[PDB]
Amino acid sequence: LKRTSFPKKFLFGAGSASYQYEGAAHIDGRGLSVWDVFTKEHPEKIADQSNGDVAQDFYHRYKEDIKSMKEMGLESFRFSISWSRILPNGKISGGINKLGIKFYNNLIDELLANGIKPLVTIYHWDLPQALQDEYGGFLSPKIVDDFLEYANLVFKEFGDRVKHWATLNEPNIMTQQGYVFGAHAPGRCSNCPAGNSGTEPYIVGHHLLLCHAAAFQLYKQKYKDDQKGIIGITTATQMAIPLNDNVANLLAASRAIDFNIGWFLHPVVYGEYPQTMRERLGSRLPKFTEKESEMLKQSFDFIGLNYYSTDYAAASSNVSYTTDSRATLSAIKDGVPIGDPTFMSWLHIYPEGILTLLRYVKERYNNPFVMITENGMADENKGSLAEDPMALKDNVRIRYHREHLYYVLEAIKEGVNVGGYYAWTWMDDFEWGSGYTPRFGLNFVDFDNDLKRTPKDSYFWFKDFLAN
């Protein structure tokens, strides 16, 4: 495969998120996020009882990393802004942390100095704890005005240089894990000290979409004419295919797609929830005003798709999101995995499924401009480079990226409007509930050797790929 086989305007990048990368969590005026609290106060929910206090210390070492990015030939770099680093209490009334602004200014100036276009995710799950304490964060409509003022500050201070934005990253996972399974911050579920897995997800999702629409409309009306950038939304797009060709399994696949992918994509393309969510949930699903519906319809310049794997969907043989779809997912059919299993239980290697996703999005949503904002896989963390000499020989990762890009190039030949691909992830990082147990990086991070970065074989494959 060769980069010259892709459109010249197509963006090739690698991605990062604030809490997963930065460290310096309690220095330089940064306020607590719900993830500081979640990792510190629920270590039993983190596979290795770890946190993001230090991560890979990107906050201090970004200059060295960006040099390694330029050497690989990276076109774009995706990174997220820590709300609580710039606004310690989440509110403009709480004061703007100048050292936080300084850090993002330095990061951005460093990327552009090295010829790398920033793609900035405004919100990648690190909500200020002060907002969760004040009104339960995304459980309240008050989040929208606090999100608006945050988005406004971000556009005003960085938008002169930043020309590519995502409002949100994977609000579906953020809502599912945060408020259905309580496996992610803020750890609410219907075992959880508080929550309702049947009601709270649909409220949280509602307020996320209202935040998205308010940030989009603000960018359109106040900043787009001057700054000439673009703004979209990234969602998690695990694909579903029917277990078989039984009409019930065809509809189960449709219902799992509507409940996971369509949940946020339907409002942003058409201005309404998927009708199968309205049919199932009645009053548990909040209703958009005519105004809101107008603000949401085509509230994007692009849609970010985060594609890792596909499952089989079958029709389903104390209300919760989990059972609301009337569908069962599995990666196995007649005791045969959909693709090679990897360290992550939910990640089978099924590169065909990314074309299936891109075809579905094309046909369902009238071929909107999309980017793959995440795609990659993880090897198990087996310790230091000395403990794991084979960590660098990531032939499986190399195969994963190669076959997925083959199918993205197929997508382009079929007139799908895909214009970006961002690897997950630049360097081994903090992976939420999994802690540092999964290594997703093109770069190895030796957490026992002063966070030394060693390029994996995948780095050199991407170097060759981008050069030709």
From TrEMBL:
Superkingdom as given in the UniProt entry: Eukaryota
What keywords are annotated for this sequence in UniProt? Glycosidase, Hydrolase
InterPro entries recorded for this chain? GH, GH_1_N_CS, Glyco_hydro_1
Does the keyword Hydrolase belong to this entry? yes
Task: Indicate the secretion signal residues.
Answer: none
SUPFAM superfamilies of this UniProt entry? (Trans)glycosidases
User: Which Cys pairs are S-S linked?
Assistant: C189-C192
**GO: which molecular function terms?**
beta-glucosidase activity
An individual GO BP term: carbohydrate metabolic process
Q: Supply the PANTHER family for this chain.
A: GLYCOSYL HYDROLASE (PTHR10353), VICIANIN HYDROLASE-LIKE (PTHR10353:SF297)
- So what family is this one in? Belongs to the glycosyl hydrolase 1 family.
Q: Which protein are we looking at? A: Beta-glucosidase
Please give the organism: Persicaria tinctoria
What is the phylogenetic placement of the source species in the record? Eukaryota, Viridiplantae, Streptophyta, Embryophyta, Tracheophyta
